[PDB]
Design a protein around this ligand. Structure first.
Ligand SMILES: [Ca+2]
Ligand SMILES: [Ca+2]
Ligand SMILES: [Cl-]
Length: 294
């Protein structure tokens, strides 16, 4: 597997803040976007498979990875809309061109799907896995994690996450089938070593998941890209997971109705990149080779 990151971290100022990202190679972008509570590090063993197939980019969401924190931070900070404003500006600053291939996961998919809907003419292909493909109901949420996430979305969330770093220390490992190494966990907890607001992004995210109609704004956004994706002819690669976690049941049933889509199944729960990186990288590279023929 390997715990070493892919390439060197680069920095650029956005909205008066500093954001970190990986940008290696030349040509049309193959954009990898992580979710909660990860960073660009999540794709370290996947991006290599796309070597020479394009400009390999992986951005650290604001307040995450090596990107700046948003002070003053609080319950109102790090909502989906705010993350979008920063990511939109970062992607604009990167001069991506008009033949972008998106590779998304978790909140990176909500952000990526929305961006794609808004810049559809610039999207050459979309590879996704364990994504937030549509608004859901509690019955659709994984049973084993249902109570905990309901707790995150309650006044108990602050103690769980800001004080005890539960999303990083409990959820993350709990949704990876193979044992992580000391170095791998170190890389994941690094941005959240300090108790308090430094960990706010990992609490604000679960409170943004479009479940049972709340929050209304994210539900509407997801409803929008869900409808669009179900009709868009843009080529797609759906990397299904077994047993999987988020993209199972009804949501998986929905994703499987999407047009011009190739699907493969790999072993894993939610953070499948840590369980089947080679299968995932190989599939993405093949997908790209078909989208960018000699
Ligand atoms: Ca071109
Ligand atoms: Ca585990
Ligand atoms: Cl979340």
């Amino acid at each position: 597997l390997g715990a070493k990151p892919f390439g060197e971290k680069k920095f650029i100022e956005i909205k008066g803040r500093r954001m970190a990202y990986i940008d290696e190679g030349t040509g049309d972008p193959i954009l990898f976007q992580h979710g909660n509570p990860t960073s660009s590090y999540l794709w370290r063993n996947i991006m290599p498979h796309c070597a020479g197939l394009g400009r390999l980019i992986a951005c650290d969401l604001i307040g995450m990875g090596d990107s700046d924190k948003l002070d003053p931070s609080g319950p109102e900070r790090y909502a989906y809309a705010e993350h979008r404003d920063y990511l939109d500006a970062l992607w604009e600053a990167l001069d991506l061109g008009d033949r972008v291939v998106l590779v998304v996961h978790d909140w990176g998919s909500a952000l990526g799907f929305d961006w794609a809907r808004r810049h559809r003419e610039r999207v050459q292909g979309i590879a996704y896995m364990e994504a937030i493909a549509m608004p859901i109901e509690w019955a659709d949420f994984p049973e084993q994690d249902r109570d905990l996430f309901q707790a995150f979305r309650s006044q108990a969330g602050e103690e769980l996450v800001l004080q005890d770093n539960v999303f990083v220390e409990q959820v993350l490992p709990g949704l990876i089938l193979r044992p992580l190494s000391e170095a791998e966990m170190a890389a994941y907890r690094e941005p959240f070593l300090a108790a308090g607001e430094a960990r706010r992004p990992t609490l604000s995210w679960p409170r943004q998941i479009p479940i049972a109609g709340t929050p209304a704004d994210v539900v509407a956004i997801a409803r929008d890209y869900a409808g669009w994706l179900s009709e868009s002819p843009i080529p797609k690669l759906f990397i299904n997971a077994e047993p999987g976690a988020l993209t199972t049941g009804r949501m998986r049933d929905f994703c499987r109705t999407w047009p011009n889509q190739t699907e493969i199944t790999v072993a894993g729960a939610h953070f499948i990149q840590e369980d089947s990186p080679d299968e995932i990288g190989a599939a993405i590279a093949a997908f790209v080779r078909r989208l960018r023929p000699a």
